[PDB]
Every structure is written in structure tokens, then in C-alpha cells.
Write a protein that binds this DNA or RNA. Structure first.
Ligand SMILES: [K+]
Ligand SMILES: [K+]
Ligand SMILES: [K+]
Ligand SMILES: [K+]
Ligand SMILES: [K+]
Ligand SMILES: [K+]
Ligand SMILES: [K+]
Ligand SMILES: [K+]
Ligand SMILES: [K+]
Ligand SMILES: [K+]
Ligand SMILES: [K+]
Ligand SMILES: [K+]
Ligand SMILES: [Mg+2]
Ligand SMILES: [Mg+2]
Ligand SMILES: [Mg+2]
Ligand SMILES: [Mg+2]
Ligand SMILES: [Mg+2]
Ligand SMILES: [Mg+2]
Ligand SMILES: [Mg+2]
Ligand SMILES: [Mg+2]
Ligand SMILES: [Mg+2]
Ligand SMILES: [Mg+2]
Ligand SMILES: [Mg+2]
Ligand SMILES: [Mg+2]
Ligand SMILES: [Mg+2]
Ligand SMILES: [Mg+2]
Ligand SMILES: [Mg+2]
Ligand SMILES: [Mg+2]
Ligand SMILES: [Mg+2]
Ligand SMILES: [Mg+2]
Ligand SMILES: [Mg+2]
Ligand SMILES: [Mg+2]
Ligand SMILES: [Mg+2]
Ligand SMILES: [Mg+2]
Ligand SMILES: [Mg+2]
Ligand SMILES: [Mg+2]
Ligand SMILES: [Mg+2]
Ligand SMILES: [Mg+2]
Ligand SMILES: [Mg+2]
Ligand SMILES: [Mg+2]
Ligand SMILES: [Mg+2]
Ligand SMILES: [Mg+2]
Ligand SMILES: [Mg+2]
Ligand SMILES: [Mg+2]
Ligand SMILES: [Mg+2]
Ligand SMILES: [Mg+2]
Ligand SMILES: [Mg+2]
Ligand SMILES: [Mg+2]
Ligand SMILES: [Mg+2]
Ligand SMILES: [Mg+2]
Ligand SMILES: [Mg+2]
Ligand SMILES: [Mg+2]
Ligand SMILES: [Mg+2]
Ligand SMILES: [Mg+2]
Ligand SMILES: [Mg+2]
Ligand SMILES: [Mg+2]
Ligand SMILES: [Mg+2]
Ligand SMILES: [Mg+2]
Ligand SMILES: [Mg+2]
Ligand SMILES: [Mg+2]
Ligand SMILES: [Mg+2]
Ligand SMILES: [Mg+2]
Ligand SMILES: [Mg+2]
Ligand SMILES: [Mg+2]
Ligand SMILES: [Mg+2]
Ligand SMILES: [Mg+2]
Ligand SMILES: [Mg+2]
Ligand SMILES: [Mg+2]
Ligand SMILES: [Mg+2]
Ligand SMILES: [Mg+2]
Ligand SMILES: [Mg+2]
Ligand SMILES: [Mg+2]
Ligand SMILES: [Mg+2]
Ligand SMILES: [Mg+2]
Ligand SMILES: [Mg+2]
Ligand SMILES: [Mg+2]
Ligand SMILES: [Mg+2]
Ligand SMILES: [Mg+2]
Ligand SMILES: [Mg+2]
Ligand SMILES: [Mg+2]
Ligand SMILES: [Mg+2]
Ligand SMILES: [Mg+2]
Ligand SMILES: [Mg+2]
Ligand SMILES: [Mg+2]
Ligand SMILES: [Mg+2]
Ligand SMILES: [Mg+2]
Ligand SMILES: [Mg+2]
Ligand SMILES: [Mg+2]
Ligand SMILES: [Mg+2]
Ligand SMILES: [Mg+2]
Ligand SMILES: [Mg+2]
Ligand SMILES: [Mg+2]
Ligand SMILES: [Mg+2]
Ligand SMILES: [Mg+2]
Ligand SMILES: [Mg+2]
Ligand SMILES: [Mg+2]
Ligand SMILES: [Mg+2]
Ligand SMILES: [Mg+2]
Ligand SMILES: [Mg+2]
Ligand SMILES: [Mg+2]
Ligand SMILES: [Mg+2]
Ligand SMILES: [Mg+2]
Ligand SMILES: [Mg+2]
Ligand SMILES: [Mg+2]
Ligand SMILES: [Mg+2]
Ligand SMILES: [Mg+2]
Ligand SMILES: [Mg+2]
Ligand SMILES: [Mg+2]
Ligand SMILES: [Mg+2]
Ligand SMILES: [Mg+2]
Ligand SMILES: [Mg+2]
Ligand SMILES: [Mg+2]
Ligand SMILES: [Mg+2]
Ligand SMILES: [Mg+2]
Ligand SMILES: [Mg+2]
Ligand SMILES: [Mg+2]
Ligand SMILES: [Mg+2]
Ligand SMILES: [Mg+2]
Ligand SMILES: [Mg+2]
Ligand SMILES: [Mg+2]
Ligand SMILES: [Mg+2]
Ligand SMILES: [Mg+2]
Ligand SMILES: [Mg+2]
Ligand SMILES: [Mg+2]
Ligand SMILES: [Mg+2]
Ligand SMILES: [Mg+2]
Ligand SMILES: [Zn+2]
Lengths: 99, 208, 83, 99
RNA sequence: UGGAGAGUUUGAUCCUGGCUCAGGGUGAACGCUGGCGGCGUGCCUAAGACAUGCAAGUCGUGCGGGCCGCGGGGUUUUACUCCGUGGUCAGCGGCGGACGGGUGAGUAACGCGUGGGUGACCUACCCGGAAGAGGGGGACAACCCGGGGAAACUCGGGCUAAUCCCCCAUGUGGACCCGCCCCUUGGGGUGUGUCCAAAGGGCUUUGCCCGCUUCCGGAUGGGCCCGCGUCCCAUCAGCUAGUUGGUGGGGUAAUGGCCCACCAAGGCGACGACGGGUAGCCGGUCUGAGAGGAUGGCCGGCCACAGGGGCACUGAGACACGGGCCCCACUCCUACGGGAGGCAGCAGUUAGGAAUCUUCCGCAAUGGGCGCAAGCCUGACGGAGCGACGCCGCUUGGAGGAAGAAGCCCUUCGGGGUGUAAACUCCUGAACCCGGGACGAAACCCCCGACGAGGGGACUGACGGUACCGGGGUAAUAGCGCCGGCCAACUCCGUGCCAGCAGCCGCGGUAAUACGGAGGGCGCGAGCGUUACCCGGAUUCACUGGGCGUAAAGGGCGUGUAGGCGGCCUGGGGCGUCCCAUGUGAAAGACCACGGCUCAACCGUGGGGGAGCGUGGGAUACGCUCAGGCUAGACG
């Protein structure tokens, strides 16, 4: 079974490509707390069909390019910019801690 | 090693009359019938209250020197018993009693366990017909411990088995004196042994 | 090719063989595909040779090649008997 | 003071010269055909593409241009020729290309 | 079936807290000592440098020759030449040299582990299935001739064979462009067009055997891709130019920014990018009640490397340890022009080091390569050798033997101790001495049958005259540490804060159970100690399982970002959570049982396991999410 994840499109600034952020909950291996991790996957959008905020399913695919190994299966739900804003604020905080 | 050397000094040091020479530990010559104090220059001096480690070590040394088994084989047998399911102490005693030399002693073929060890090592004892010369051999229930047909003419065996006429054997052993053989019927229970040892003290000694 | 041969598993002066299906390019004691029997050359126990006949027939059907000793041991177990 | 496995080396050299030749032909012919397809000379283009495909398969007979890779070269050649003649038209000789 | 604590801060106490000890372990080393055997194990350092021998070849059933020799022919003789045959040598040709063997350098990475993907792939030999092999042509070695070089070797000319190379044909079929259909990433089918096949040899000789060609499938082996897991430093906070993406190409068996053109400006990062350091990873192993900590030697799996660096050729497969090329360092030859070489294969040498082995035997067994086979090769392997390095088994005697020799040590001078210990008495018989003497070895092969099934026959043992069996047969190595407390074991003398001891507390300055010796005792025993390292105790990095008023520890205070956490009620989803079924979890190891070496160590057979992850189905209390509602929190 080819892995099928579900995430949020947070970057449509590339050509025929979208950055889908995928979260996952799991108990900590030693401390048992259900912790939440995440990972960004570069998925293939050959029709520019999906835009920012779209929650979409992603499927393991034949490699399209270096770092691009997934295709957008279908659209789970339309643009919800709240998770996108959360990710953008997380990124924007990085400029405040340099020196 | 076998600790080879003086033995009735252990009859003295352990405070309990041991039977390491067979006879002469029953005769008024054991040096325990006449000198119950431990050996050495400081044997007759007033003893101090021994530590708990002292008590457990003395009890374990008593039980180990009764059989004449080295520390290596002793600890190995104890760990083997602790691995098994059941009471560690009674199983350990059943293991120690299952040694071929100890069975030869218990069957009255030899007067002492060390004499039995020499009888085994020199191939004078057979197990189920086949000759066995290993004191550490473990006898299973049902094994026939016999005397070699070529050794049944020896003077010492004649003496020992001529004295065994009329003597009873352990509840877990059978003896045929005419055929000079016997059978290990079962493992001995704790109630079958009259050893002056507290097994729980040895278990606690190795528990450290 | 895939072969049916013996592997040595006993100790020194105590040889014990596993009749085994493995790639010929692998070491004789290495990762085999399946153990299809065992063989004791010194005949220490009354059961000193056992072979899974159906499995040996399968591996011969798919294209395995046994050694001369392996083929002898299989023939003793009636792998090729068609009476 | 060495062993006669040097013989193998010798053989490789021969085979090397055998291979470089065939490929050097194939490549050459391919280019030639493509030229005629760019200039519209369809008859000669297909007539040379036939010989190119033949040399490709003959090289595939041995260890020179084995595997498919030969089918890959044939595919790319036929595709490029048919595409370049479509920029002009009139597939005159009707050679390797299907109707 | 599983969990022990103790010493030490004080005049005494309770606490906090560190240090230390008792335990187990090792690829160990060192000291003293040292008898036998079995099974294991043995460069952890310089991935430093290597003399020498061996370690990878094999096919005359693919092909033609050279040299040496014999036999038989054409001839009256000679010359010349033909056929058969033996030995030897390479050559051309095929297969193997990519396995096996070594090592841990480098690598923090799809390297490994684990579970998946390949509609994006390959696989020589092997197995099954379908079909085919017609005709013609050519070249290079060997060899003959000549040249260059000190050598390695090299150049030119000429003759020739083939399972060498090429052309045409046959098209079972396959390949490709295009179209259609099914299917859904490049899977499968179909039509026209085009393109592509082959090699012969051996006989028991017109019939089989070893092969050859095209195609489909199996099997095995592998390539690539993805989820999750994988050390330390944030006294490394920003990294990135093939960088991220696209289009079109090149390339490969195959995807890919792998590479290249052009276009877009992206990609990564406190959920730790980048940098630095360290390190093969795992099955496992050691320890631990467990959780966990530590580790990755032997054996098995995967990786990487072959003096350092780079690169392609050949091939089914290599970026090739014992193949090739170039640069660098090194060593050797050198006619100074130029060449040769690569133990981290076995053994051995040397250097370093506290420290790690034989320049051994064998092709008998198992396994591998070539061959129809015979057979050849195999420092893989099977064995032996050396080393108490480890584990296990065993010996240095057994029984009798004085109110108790001597010597030696204490002493109230009565005596006490070494101690049944000894000498002695009787008994067995380690060593050794003889004789017998293996299993491991029945296949390949040959004969019958049908080169099948089946039956029968014969050859072959390195270990080794070893194991084992029988007879004979001598009382015949014991050592090391400790004795103030923790911690089992006490006296005498000498010494006088001296000489020394010491793991921690501590002992010695005149009468030391602590130094040194003696007697005695305790503990282990062919060992005993020491040092080093790991876990343990240590609940002393506290998930299980700790703390912060005064013992180490609440930030000087606030505002607030991310993050963590979230009152009551109803419903949808089923992400966490839970359940069932199923796949996976190699073997070895671990556990249990039985069995084989007389036992054991060692080994064999069988049994049981197991988290995690994949898939299918189910549950909805809680956590999550979405939709709605409430007012007890909060705000107004
Ligand atoms: K846990
Ligand atoms: K930035
Ligand atoms: K105290
Ligand atoms: K020439
Ligand atoms: K056709
Ligand atoms: K090679
Ligand atoms: K036969
Ligand atoms: K005898
Ligand atoms: K005798
Ligand atoms: K002095
Ligand atoms: K002293
Ligand atoms: K403060
Ligand atoms: Mg999400
Ligand atoms: Mg876009
Ligand atoms: Mg692309
Ligand atoms: Mg028990
Ligand atoms: Mg237990
Ligand atoms: Mg392999
Ligand atoms: Mg049988
Ligand atoms: Mg069959
Ligand atoms: Mg060669
Ligand atoms: Mg060759
Ligand atoms: Mg050209
Ligand atoms: Mg190639
Ligand atoms: Mg229970
Ligand atoms: Mg319970
Ligand atoms: Mg303390
Ligand atoms: Mg104080
Ligand atoms: Mg004090
Ligand atoms: Mg005070
Ligand atoms: Mg220790
Ligand atoms: Mg220790
Ligand atoms: Mg010595
Ligand atoms: Mg040995
Ligand atoms: Mg060895
Ligand atoms: Mg090394
Ligand atoms: Mg190490
Ligand atoms: Mg042939
Ligand atoms: Mg002649
Ligand atoms: Mg004539
Ligand atoms: Mg003449
Ligand atoms: Mg010849
Ligand atoms: Mg030859
Ligand atoms: Mg040559
Ligand atoms: Mg290898
Ligand atoms: Mg690094
Ligand atoms: Mg890093
Ligand atoms: Mg993976
Ligand atoms: Mg990773
Ligand atoms: Mg995997
Ligand atoms: Mg082939
Ligand atoms: Mg076939
Ligand atoms: Mg010809
Ligand atoms: Mg010709
Ligand atoms: Mg010719
Ligand atoms: Mg000539
Ligand atoms: Mg020429
Ligand atoms: Mg056709
Ligand atoms: Mg043709
Ligand atoms: Mg050919
Ligand atoms: Mg031909
Ligand atoms: Mg014929
Ligand atoms: Mg790149
Ligand atoms: Mg591209
Ligand atoms: Mg492409
Ligand atoms: Mg290739
Ligand atoms: Mg980056
Ligand atoms: Mg993350
Ligand atoms: Mg390293
Ligand atoms: Mg345990
Ligand atoms: Mg553990
Ligand atoms: Mg690790
Ligand atoms: Mg390793
Ligand atoms: Mg390994
Ligand atoms: Mg080197
Ligand atoms: Mg190099
Ligand atoms: Mg290199
Ligand atoms: Mg090949
Ligand atoms: Mg390599
Ligand atoms: Mg190379
Ligand atoms: Mg070499
Ligand atoms: Mg060279
Ligand atoms: Mg030195
Ligand atoms: Mg060795
Ligand atoms: Mg030899
Ligand atoms: Mg062999
Ligand atoms: Mg063989
Ligand atoms: Mg070996
Ligand atoms: Mg021992
Ligand atoms: Mg005596
Ligand atoms: Mg005698
Ligand atoms: Mg036999
Ligand atoms: Mg043979
Ligand atoms: Mg015949
Ligand atoms: Mg037969
Ligand atoms: Mg012999
Ligand atoms: Mg004898
Ligand atoms: Mg004490
Ligand atoms: Mg001392
Ligand atoms: Mg220490
Ligand atoms: Mg004095
Ligand atoms: Mg004094
Ligand atoms: Mg003293
Ligand atoms: Mg002494
Ligand atoms: Mg030691
Ligand atoms: Mg410690
Ligand atoms: Mg802990
Ligand atoms: Mg604990
Ligand atoms: Mg600490
Ligand atoms: Mg806690
Ligand atoms: Mg605390
Ligand atoms: Mg405050
Ligand atoms: Mg938040
Ligand atoms: Mg918040
Ligand atoms: Mg709630
Ligand atoms: Mg929340
Ligand atoms: Mg609900
Ligand atoms: Mg669920
Ligand atoms: Mg297992
Ligand atoms: Mg364990
Ligand atoms: Mg047994
Ligand atoms: Mg299970
Ligand atoms: Mg499910
Ligand atoms: Mg429901
Ligand atoms: Mg609400
Ligand atoms: Mg208010
Ligand atoms: Zn006594």
C-alpha cells in the first residue's frame, strides 16, 4: 500500500508543486505524553488545481524530482487559512532570535 | 583441588560432627568427640557474637564441605537450582544428592564420600552396565548403579558390602548386596535428609 | 543458480548438517532460503536423516540443483522414488 | 610474475574497439536522418532511419547495445523523425513509421 | 518466579549529600604460581611498512598451431610430402576472475533497522513452456620475416582456423513509431508499417548427448523510491547557486536536478537546518527486579573500503583487493631515457604497544569455479600446533593411625597449638608400558535397467596408530590473597610519625590483631591476586522513581509570541485510544523439553514464544476534530 498522508497546502509559489504540511500524533517513547510532530512534503500539482489553505490527501508516487516524491490524491477540504497563518507565524518568529 | 588435607579439623571448625572419614567419626577418635573447639591457637578462646555474614558463610561452608564439592561446582549447582521452578533449597539438595559419588556413598559401597570419589574415578562403578568414572555425573531416577564385575573381587568392596548386610538404605534408594548393585528410585525429599544444614541460610548467603 | 546442499552446524569432530536451499554464491553457513532437512553422518541417533519430501520436490520443480551428496541423501529419503 | 588473467584484459580491448565502432555508426546515422527530417526530405530521411534502426537492433544482438536501451534509442529516433516531418508533411517513402 | 545493603561530615543526633566497598562481566594485560584433557578463543595500537612461499582458475567434447619424439604411408633410393599417435608450450575462443577471504579507515547518511512501493526496473548459470537453426563472406593472434629498447616490453609486414566477427534469408515470436480497446503513471491486448534470430561439437553415428537462437513464465539475486527509528555540543542560529521548481533534452536496466540547456524564485531551519565532534549499523552481547544503562569482539545479515585521490573499459553483473589508466607519497630495478610494485587473503617479518599465534597438515569431509566425464584449482574449509585467554571435566590419593613423636609457635611454665596432620599399616592405580584400533565414507563413477525410478558393484581418512577398548602398572605438582571496621580470619617479635601500609574510614612518635617477619587462622584453588574498562548497587538525571523557605536549586518584575494544557450538554467523523483476524518478526543466541559425545562445557531435534509495523473488519468511554447549544471560568 502506497502511503497516503493528509496535510495543508502552505506554498503554491512553485510551478506545478505545492508544499503540504502533515502532522502526526504519537505517544513519546519514554515519557508517554502524546506529542505532535510535523513534516513538509513537496507534492506534485500538474494542473495548479490546489491553492493555499487547501487541506489535501497526498500519495506516495514515482519520483518526480529531487525532494519531490508525492502526488496530490484529492482535496479533503477547501482553503482554511488558519493553519497556514499558524505556520507562517512559526516561521516569522525565527527572525527574532539571531543576536 | 578438592581441599585435600585434614578433614576432622572441619568436624571441629564447623562445630558439628561431620563424617568425612566414614568410620573414626563414629569411633571415639573423631577429635570432635574429644575436642569440640575450632582449630588453631585461638580455638579455646571465648567466641565473639558472629555477624550475620559469619553465620551464613559458616552454614554454606558446612553444607559444601559435607559433600566435598568445590566452590565452582557448588555455585553452579545452586544457580541451576535457582533457575528451575520449585523450592530452591530442596531442589539444590536433590541435585547434590544426585551426584554419582554421593550415591555410591549413600549406597554403602564406600564408607566416605571421598573414598566413593576414588572408587568412581578409578572406574570401579558402572551406571546401567556402562562404566562411569565421573563423580559429578548426575544420576537420574531409575538408573542402576552397579559395581564393575572386574572390581567385585577387591578387598575393600568385599568389606564394605559385607558390612552392609542388614543395614538399611535411604528411602529413595534400593540395594542388592549379592549382585553388588542398587537403584536410584527417586529424588530425595527434604524430610529424607538428616543433614545439619539450614538451606535457607545458604540461599540468603548467595542472595547477597 | 539456487542449490540444495549441506550446511555444517555441529562442533569440531561432531559434524551435523542442515540440508538447505540457498543461492550457490553464498557461503555454505550463510543465510539460506529454507531448511528442508537434517543429516547426522556419524549415526548417533536412530533418526539421523530427515527430509521434507514435498518441499524438496517443490524446489526441484522450480529449478534447484542438489549436490552429489545432497542428491544422495534425498534419494535415500525417496524424493525421486516414483514407484 | 603475474597470472594469465591478463588475457581477459586483452579481450576487453578488442571488444571495446568493437563496441565504440557500432555506437559511433548509430549516432552518426541518427543525426543524418534527423537532418533530413528538419529539411523536409522525407524519402531519404525514412530510408536512412530504417538503416539506423537496423544497426541499433544488430548492435542489440550482442553485448554492445543490449537491453532495451536499444528500444529507447529506436523510440527517440522514430519520434523525433515523425515530429520533424510533421513540421513539413508528406511522409514519402513510408518506411519504419506506421501508417 | 522478581528488588538485601554497608563504611564515611558530629562530643552525640536527624537530614541533605558526595566519595568508597561487597556483585556480575572482558578479544584483556601484569605479578606470583603452574599437572592433564575437551570445546572455544587470540593486533582492541600504526587502515604503519612488508622479504619469502602459497592464496584463481578451468575446458583438446569450441579452433588452428610451435617444439621434442614415435609409428604407418606416396618413392627403387633421395628430396619432398600424407595419416595416426605421445609429451609439452602458449595462443585464439567460452565460462569463472563481481563469489568465496580480509579489514572498520570513511560514513550521522535511505548507511543501517523495520514496514512498504516499483504503472520506474535488471538478473549469467538453473527450471517449465512455444518455435527455430537455411546460404554466403571476413578478420586478428598463434606462426613466419624485419626493426626499436639495458629492461618492462614494443612497432611494422605476411599466412591461417573456429562455438571469433559480418551479410542475406526464414518472423514462432519480440522491438519501435502511430491508431483503437481494456486497464489506469511507462500494465495488458490489437492492426498496418519497419526492424531483429542462430554454432557447432561429441560419440555407444543417421540416433542420442553437450550445446546455440528468439520469446513467455518461474525461481533466485539485486537496483531505485517512501513512512518511522538511529550519539554529543546551541560556547554552531541562520543555511542554500544545481540551490528549489518547471519545460525540453542527454544518460541508465530504470525514476530522478543524475547531468545539460532555457525559464520561474524558490527550498531548508529552535519539531534544531547549517556547522563541529564522535562513530560502520543490526541480529545480539554484558548488566539490571524491571524500565533502563553500556556495547556491536567471535558467529549471522546489510554497508563501506583495498597505499591516498580520481576515472572509465570489459561484462548478466564491477568503477573490479590478488584487472586497466592518470596524479601523489613510498620502496625496488636502471645503460638515468625509463620501468616494476601494493598482505586491511593464509602464515610469517618489522615498527608501535601493557598485549595477541604456525613461514604446520590435508582435498578425506562440506562448500565453491571450470569440465559430458575422468579430473583440475580452492591458505574457503576440515584439522593439527602455540598461549591457564575463557568455559567445562579431572588429578596431586583412599581407609586405619597417640589423651597426641620431633621440629616450629605460644605459655599463668601446670600446659596449649600446628593435628590424624605426619611417619607409618593395608588398598586402589594419574602417569606411563604394551596389543587391538575406529565412526566420520558413499556418493560422483561403473554395470543392469531406459544415461530415469530402482538394484548392484568399486575407489577414496588430513586428523591418525588419534579417540576408544583390553591387559599391565608407580602414592604420584600446590599455590595465591587476606586476618583494625566495612569483611570470614590473632597472637609473638622486630621497628618507634622511622621504615612502611592504605578501596573508603584510617594505622606507625616504646610495649602496633593495620608496618615488616614468624606461628596460627580465613578464603579460593591450577589457579590466586592486581590494574584497566562496562553495568550494578545509584531512588546519585528519579518514565517507572527525586527535588528547589533555612541543605545545591524559583528567573528582579511584568507584558506577551510560539508551544503545552482546556468548564458543562448534544450530534457527525474515528486521528489518538481500544478490540478481533491476518501478514511480517531469517538462522544463531535466550527460555523449555528430549537426545548425542562415559558427565559437563559443546552440540543436535522439537516446542513456546514476542513488542513494533502492514492489511481487513469492529468499538466510541476518554483525548482529537467539525457543527450546534449552556453559563458556574473569564470579560463587560
Ligand atoms: K517505559
Ligand atoms: K530568513
Ligand atoms: K555514625
Ligand atoms: K604482429
Ligand atoms: K506486423
Ligand atoms: K577483480
Ligand atoms: K542409479
Ligand atoms: K585397568
Ligand atoms: K587392574
Ligand atoms: K628502619
Ligand atoms: K602484620
Ligand atoms: K536568586
Ligand atoms: Mg494536518
Ligand atoms: Mg503554484
Ligand atoms: Mg521534473
Ligand atoms: Mg528455584
Ligand atoms: Mg527462580
Ligand atoms: Mg550473494
Ligand atoms: Mg532413514
Ligand atoms: Mg520426483
Ligand atoms: Mg586469465
Ligand atoms: Mg582464460
Ligand atoms: Mg561522426
Ligand atoms: Mg555494458
Ligand atoms: Mg502468577
Ligand atoms: Mg505476579
Ligand atoms: Mg551514604
Ligand atoms: Mg559540620
Ligand atoms: Mg570524629
Ligand atoms: Mg554541635
Ligand atoms: Mg568489580
Ligand atoms: Mg570484579
Ligand atoms: Mg613461569
Ligand atoms: Mg585447544
Ligand atoms: Mg585456532
Ligand atoms: Mg586494526
Ligand atoms: Mg573493544
Ligand atoms: Mg562443450
Ligand atoms: Mg616418419
Ligand atoms: Mg608403384
Ligand atoms: Mg639418392
Ligand atoms: Mg600439440
Ligand atoms: Mg592450452
Ligand atoms: Mg601475446
Ligand atoms: Mg566478501
Ligand atoms: Mg558531522
Ligand atoms: Mg549535525
Ligand atoms: Mg527504509
Ligand atoms: Mg533518515
Ligand atoms: Mg527494507
Ligand atoms: Mg547466454
Ligand atoms: Mg529453457
Ligand atoms: Mg571461412
Ligand atoms: Mg575465410
Ligand atoms: Mg581467407
Ligand atoms: Mg608463413
Ligand atoms: Mg597484419
Ligand atoms: Mg507476428
Ligand atoms: Mg533479417
Ligand atoms: Mg556468435
Ligand atoms: Mg554462418
Ligand atoms: Mg549422422
Ligand atoms: Mg544536485
Ligand atoms: Mg528532466
Ligand atoms: Mg526522460
Ligand atoms: Mg551498465
Ligand atoms: Mg539543504
Ligand atoms: Mg519536524
Ligand atoms: Mg571512525
Ligand atoms: Mg537477567
Ligand atoms: Mg535490556
Ligand atoms: Mg548503538
Ligand atoms: Mg563485524
Ligand atoms: Mg559480524
Ligand atoms: Mg597497508
Ligand atoms: Mg591507488
Ligand atoms: Mg584508491
Ligand atoms: Mg558474463
Ligand atoms: Mg567498489
Ligand atoms: Mg580498481
Ligand atoms: Mg594482495
Ligand atoms: Mg602495470
Ligand atoms: Mg617493541
Ligand atoms: Mg590460530
Ligand atoms: Mg598442503
Ligand atoms: Mg575438496
Ligand atoms: Mg566436491
Ligand atoms: Mg580453520
Ligand atoms: Mg577447572
Ligand atoms: Mg589421611
Ligand atoms: Mg598393586
Ligand atoms: Mg560407513
Ligand atoms: Mg572424488
Ligand atoms: Mg547402457
Ligand atoms: Mg544407487
Ligand atoms: Mg592413517
Ligand atoms: Mg587401563
Ligand atoms: Mg571480623
Ligand atoms: Mg598489606
Ligand atoms: Mg579498585
Ligand atoms: Mg622495642
Ligand atoms: Mg612490639
Ligand atoms: Mg599484625
Ligand atoms: Mg601461614
Ligand atoms: Mg583473574
Ligand atoms: Mg561503579
Ligand atoms: Mg538508575
Ligand atoms: Mg534500582
Ligand atoms: Mg553523580
Ligand atoms: Mg519523576
Ligand atoms: Mg534530591
Ligand atoms: Mg521572586
Ligand atoms: Mg497554540
Ligand atoms: Mg496560545
Ligand atoms: Mg472537554
Ligand atoms: Mg487544543
Ligand atoms: Mg459523539
Ligand atoms: Mg481508528
Ligand atoms: Mg529466533
Ligand atoms: Mg538478560
Ligand atoms: Mg546425556
Ligand atoms: Mg504473537
Ligand atoms: Mg484498522
Ligand atoms: Mg459511532
Ligand atoms: Mg462552541
Ligand atoms: Mg463584573
Ligand atoms: Zn571427624
Amino acid at each position: 500500500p502506497k502511503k497516503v498522508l493528509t496535510g495543508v497546502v502552505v506554498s503554491d509559489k512553485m510551478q506545478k508543486t505545492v508544499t503540504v504540511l502533515v502532522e502526526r500524533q504519537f505517544p513519546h517513547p519514554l515519557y508517554g505524553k502524546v506529542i505532535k510532530r510535523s513534516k513538509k512534503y513537496l507534492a506534485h500539482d500538474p494542473e495548479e488545481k490546489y491553492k493555499l489553505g487547501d487541506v489535501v490527501e497526498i500519495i506516495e508516487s514515482r519520483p518526480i524530482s529531487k525532494r519531490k516524491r508525492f502526488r496530490v490524491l484529492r482535496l479533503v477540504e477547501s482553503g482554511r487559512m488558519d493553519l497556514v497563518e499558524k505556520y507562517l507565524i512559526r516561521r516569522q518568529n525565527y527572525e527574532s532570535l539571531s543576536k | 583441588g578438592r581441599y585435600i588435607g585434614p578433614v576432622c579439623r572441619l568436624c571441629r571448625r564447623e562445630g558439628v560432627k561431620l563424617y568425612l572419614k566414614g568410620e573414626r567419626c563414629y569411633s571415639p577418635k573423631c577429635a570432635m568427640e574429644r575436642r569440640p573447639y575450632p582449630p588453631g591457637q585461638h580455638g579455646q578462646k571465648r567466641a565473639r557474637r558472629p555477624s550475620d555474614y559469619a553465620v551464613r558463610l559458616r552454614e554454606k561452608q558446612k553444607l559444601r564441605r559435607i559433600y566435598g564439592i568445590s566452590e565452582r561446582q557448588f555455585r553452579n549447582l545452586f544457580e541451576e537450582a535457582s533457575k528451575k521452578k520449585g523450592v530452591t533449597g530442596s531442589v539444590f539438595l536433590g541435585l547434590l544428592e544426585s551426584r554419582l559419588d554421593n550415591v555410591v556413598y549413600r549406597l554403602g559401597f564406600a564408607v566416605s564420600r571421598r573414598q566413593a570419589r576414588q572408587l568412581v574415578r578409578h572406574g570401579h562403578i558402572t551406571v546401567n552396565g556402562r562404566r562411569v568414572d565421573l563423580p559429578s555425573y548426575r544420576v537420574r531416577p531409575g538408573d542402576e548403579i552397579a559395581v564393575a564385575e572386574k572390581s567385585r573381587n577387591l578387598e575393600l568392596i568385599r568389606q564394605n558390602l559385607e558390612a552392609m548386610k542388614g543395614r538399611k538404605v535411604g528411602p529413595w534408594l534400593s540395594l542388592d548386596v549379592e549382585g553388588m548393585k542398587g537403584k536410584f528410585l527417586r529424588l530425595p525429599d527434604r524430610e529424607d535428609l538428616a543433614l545439619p544444614v539450614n538451606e535457607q541460610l545458604v540461599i540468603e548467603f548467595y542472595s547477597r | 543458480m539456487v542449490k540444495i546442499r549441506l550446511a555444517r552446524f555441529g562442533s569440531k569432530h561432531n559434524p551435523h548438517y542442515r540440508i538447505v536451499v540457498t543461492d550457490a554464491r553464498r557461503k555454505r553457513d550463510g543465510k539460506y532460503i529454507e531448511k528442508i532437512g537434517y543429516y547426522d553422518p556419524r549415526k548417533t541417533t536412530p533418526d539421523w536423516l530427515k527430509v521434507d519430501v514435498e518441499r524438496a520436490r517443490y524446489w526441484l520443480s522450480v529449478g534447484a540443483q542438489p549436490t552429489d551428496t545432497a542428491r544422495r541423501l534425498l534419494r535415500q529419503a525417496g524424493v525421486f522414488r516414483q514407484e | 610474475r603475474n597470472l594469465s588473467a591478463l588475457k581477459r584484459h586483452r579481450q576487453s580491448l578488442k571488444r571495446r574497439l568493437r563496441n565504440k565502432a557500432k555506437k559511433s555508426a548509430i549516432k552518426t546515422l541518427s543525426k543524418k536522418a534527423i537532418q533530413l527530417a528538419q529539411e523536409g526530405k522525407a524519402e531519404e530521411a525514412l530510408k536512412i532511419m530504417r538503416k539506423a534502426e537496423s544497426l541499433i537492433d544488430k548492435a542489440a544482438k550482442g553485448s554492445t547495445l543490449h537491453k532495451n536501451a536499444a528500444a529507447r534509442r529506436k523510440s527517440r529516433l522514430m519520434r523525433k523523425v515523425r515530429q520533424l516531418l510533421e513540421a513539413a508533411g508528406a511522409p514519402l517513402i513510408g518506411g519504419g513509421l506506421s501508417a
